[PDB]
Design a protein around this ligand. Structure first.
Ligand code: CA
Length: 559
């Protein structure tokens, strides 16, 4: 029964404003820098842009600690700039999604400033304030960003709750006044015409009644305890009923800490909650659930089995986003491909083909379209992210893990690998800034930059452009049902996308050797749609493919 919508068949691009384009030489990207480059994104073929938080913030967590929801970040520009970004996008038929961060505010936000003044302030129970127990915190909750999730306040002697930085106190959603104020805030932005909202850590809004301690076992996977709040779907559905269902918008849910088997309740269209699932299963398939900075080896069979299970779980009534990287994860060509110079461009084109042939709304993160890589961080001070500093404090400063072993993992897992500034050209600081970038630019910018690619028809950029054109032209690549040809194959990832008689096959060789691959059953090729790194001709009725290393392709199959 499912209906097409613009957001199901959109190709989104994600801009992290702080690292996209600086137009005033302070080293920090800003809104004018986005506006300046809308034609570049239109040329790529992007339907909609999701921007990370753009609100007044002290930047403990680069926009995710909001000091005033109705004001533009000072480093990003003014309200007039933000309105111009909407206006200039609208002229180009591009839709804007903004990031909604309402699990918590900055500890500088006026509500918290008031809350913390005494048990008595009308804003006290806007946040969570509990007595200590035995001269320590109210319970054994840890924070995602290091140490205890409870911060002592010497004035009152109680502690306040912060799942994330102590500068990110959690809002009390159990207070209907808090929920009402947040809805008013959402209407202020929605009335400006924004087309989409992405809800940061949407699954933590409901806290566990009476805050009991976590078990020893729970402490090793605590995020999954924080998403078990008994009213979470009541609150998300109330927000849908009172606000979301009043605008023509697309809503995405970042369901951090939600196991896949509890995800469909946020996205089933019958439930009137949210529209698009942002899950962590694939992008962190190789991350430890306890030591969340640690990675382990992974295989293509592990990867594809997660793709399939994520696809199955959305089923008839939910809907997924699909992304291999974003501002919270290492770059896709490094993590999932081979970023050495022999292979980088082929592997980036193969992961683009994978991304843009999923039954999901694809999100392209800034710079993935050039094949940008992870950055060669050497020492702990080369990073800037609050989260990596919290993991260092919890695991290296306690002597639990050697500094060098920790660094070998966070070089591969740090959020900062995707935050080095966008590589526009081969000029100084890759054309990102006339001043000093806030985070050092990868020296590979001389090889990997947009200017070198945009007019080269063989570039990663133009392969993405072609794939997006192909996706927009073939309905089965958006809405077709997905079948993995062999979930246990660790060499060649092959799967079909089917709408009625229209059946297409995607084949990607993840090996760096030639692989012969014979199709199953009676499948045979009707025609080639696109290939990268092919050295062979594929004809009507062919049943076998010779795949060069990192070869990728889309084919239409015979009925
Ligand atoms: Ca700037």
């Amino acid at each position: 029964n499912a209906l097409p919508t613009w957001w199901k068949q959109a190709v989104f691009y994600q801009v992290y404003p702080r690292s996209f384009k600086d137009t005033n030489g302070d080293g920090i990207g800003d809104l004018n820098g986005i506006i300046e480059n809308l034609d570049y994104l239109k040329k790529l073929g992007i339907d909609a842009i999701w921007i990370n938080p753009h609100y007044d913030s002290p930047n403990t967590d680069n926009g995710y600690d909001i000091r005033d929801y109705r004001k533009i970040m000072k480093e990003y520009g003014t309200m007039e700039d933000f309105d111009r970004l909407i206006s200039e996008m609208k002229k180009r038929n591009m839709r804007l999604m903004i990031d909604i961060v309402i699990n918590h505010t900055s500890d500088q936000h006026a509500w918290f400033v008031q809350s913390k003044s005494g048990k008595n302030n009308p804003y006290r129970d806007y946040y969570f304030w509990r007595d200590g127990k035995d001269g320590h915190a109210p319970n054994n909750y840890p924070s995602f960003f290091g140490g205890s999730a409870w911060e002592k306040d010497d004035k009152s002697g109680q502690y306040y709750l912060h799942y994330f930085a102590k500068q990110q106190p959690d809002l009390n959603w159990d207070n209907p006044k808090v929920r009402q104020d947040l809805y008013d805030m959402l209407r202020f932005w929605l009335d400006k015409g924004v087309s989409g909202l992405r809800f940061d850590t949407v699954a933590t809004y409901s806290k566990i009644p009476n805050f009991p301690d976590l078990s020893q076992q729970q402490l090793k996977n605590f995020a999954e305890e924080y998403t078990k709040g008994p009213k979470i779907h009541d609150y998300v559905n109330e927000m849908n009923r009172e606000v979301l269902s009043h605008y023509d918008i697309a809503t995405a849910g970042e369901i951090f800490g939600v196991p896949l088997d509890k995800s469909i309740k946020f996205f089933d269209r019958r439930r009137n909650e949210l529209n698009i699932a942002f899950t962590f299963d694939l992008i962190r398939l190789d991350r430890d659930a306890d030591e969340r900075w640690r990675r382990k080896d992974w295989t293509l069979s592990q990867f594809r089995k997660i793709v399939d299970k994520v696809d199955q779980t959305a089923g008839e009534y939910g809907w997924n986003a699909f992304f291999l990287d974003n501002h919270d994860n290492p770059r896709a060509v490094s993590h999932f491909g081979d970023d050495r110079p022999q292979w980088r461009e082929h592997a980036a084109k193969a992961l683009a083909t994978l991304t843009l042939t999923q039954r999901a709304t694809p999100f392209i993160y800034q710079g993935s379209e050039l094949g940008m890589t992870n950055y060669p961080f050497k020492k702990i001070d080369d990073f800037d992210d609050v989260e990596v500093k919290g993991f260092w404090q919890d695991y290296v400063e306690t002597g639990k893990v050697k500094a060098e072993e920790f660094l070998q993992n966070v070089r591969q897992t740090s959020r900062d690998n995707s935050r080095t500034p966008f590589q526009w050209d081969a000029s100084k600081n890759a054309g990102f800034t006339s001043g000093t970038p806030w985070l050092k630019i990868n020296p590979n910018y001389k090889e990997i930059n947009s200017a070198d690619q945009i007019n080269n028809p063989n570039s990663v950029f133009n392969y993405y452009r072609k794939l997006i054109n192909i996706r927009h032209d073939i309905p089965a690549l958006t809405y077709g049902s997905y079948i993995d040809l062999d979930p246990d194959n660790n060499s060649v990832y092959a799967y079909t996308r089917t709408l009625g008689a229209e059946k297409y096959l995607v084949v990607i060789n993840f090996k760096e050797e030639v692989m012969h691959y014979t199709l199953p059953g009676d499948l045979s090729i009707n025609k080639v749609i696109t290939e990268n790194n092919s050295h062979t001709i594929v004809n009507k009725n062919d049943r076998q493919l010779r795949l060069e290393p990192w070869q990728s392709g889309i084919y239409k199959l015979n009925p």
